[PDB]
């Protein structure tokens, strides 16, 4: 059961039914990000000693700068893909909105009929109170 | 050179637990649950990829969670799920899941490699 208790929370279903029709991965975006965070050692690298003169290991710290520069590059249109979710979020919210702001209407004249509809009753109560 | 699709076997192997302590420390800073999709994905990710049951189970939440909140990341997590599932040993939940991951990129080689092995799992336990 509390095997059962799990599979309660995590449940989904009408969604499952509407998923949307370069990418980058959110895997991906998980790979090019562990070594990054082994920086952990010491997202910008090293740059001091910079001007010292192996062409080698110069070579193996240009590395460690276009490795991050991917990742950041990685991280920026994630970040950036979030930014559109949440722009379509305001865009269903913002029709949901009006959507709703119709039902105003809808239901601000089928008042206006009830209260109109109530005064020609209000008013033949008068004309009836012309008699006993 | 890795891929748009992590493979099984990749989520079979886990982080060293400081690396996943490191996937946690980030998704805290970024605001456990304000923190952006990829972090919190990213430790997601670990937690199934790591082997005890409540960790992997908190994964499949925070995938699920993703799930909910970003359409644009919806076709891709039905997989990080059956993952998920299948690793947690929830198996039908997972065919559920792949199916329907199945029908929009059908043609996808991991697609249908986890579908098929997802599956046989269902069998092999309908021995």
Partial sequence: ?132 | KVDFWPTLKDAYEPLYPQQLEILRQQVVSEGGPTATIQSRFNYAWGLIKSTDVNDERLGVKILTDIYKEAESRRRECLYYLTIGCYKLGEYSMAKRYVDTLFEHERNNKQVGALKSMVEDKIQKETL
């Fill in chain 1, 1 to 132: 059961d509390n095997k059962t208790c799990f599979r309660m929370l995590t449940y989904i279903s009408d969604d499952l039914l509407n998923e949307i029709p370069k990418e980058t991965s959110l895997f991906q975006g998980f790979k090019s990000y562990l070594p990054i965070a082994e920086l952990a050692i010491e997202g910008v690298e090293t740059a001091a000693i910079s001007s010292s003169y192996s062409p080698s290991a110069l070579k193996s710290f240009s590395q460690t700068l276009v490795n991050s520069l991917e990742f950041l590059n990685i991280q920026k249109n994630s970040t950036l893909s979030e930014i559109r979710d949440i722009e379509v979020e305001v865009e269903n919210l913002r029709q949901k909105k009006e959507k709703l702001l119709g039902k105003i209407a809808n239901i601000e004249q089928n008042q206006l009929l009830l209260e109109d509809n109530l005064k020609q009753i209000d008013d033949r109560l008068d004309f009836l109170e012309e008699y006993g």
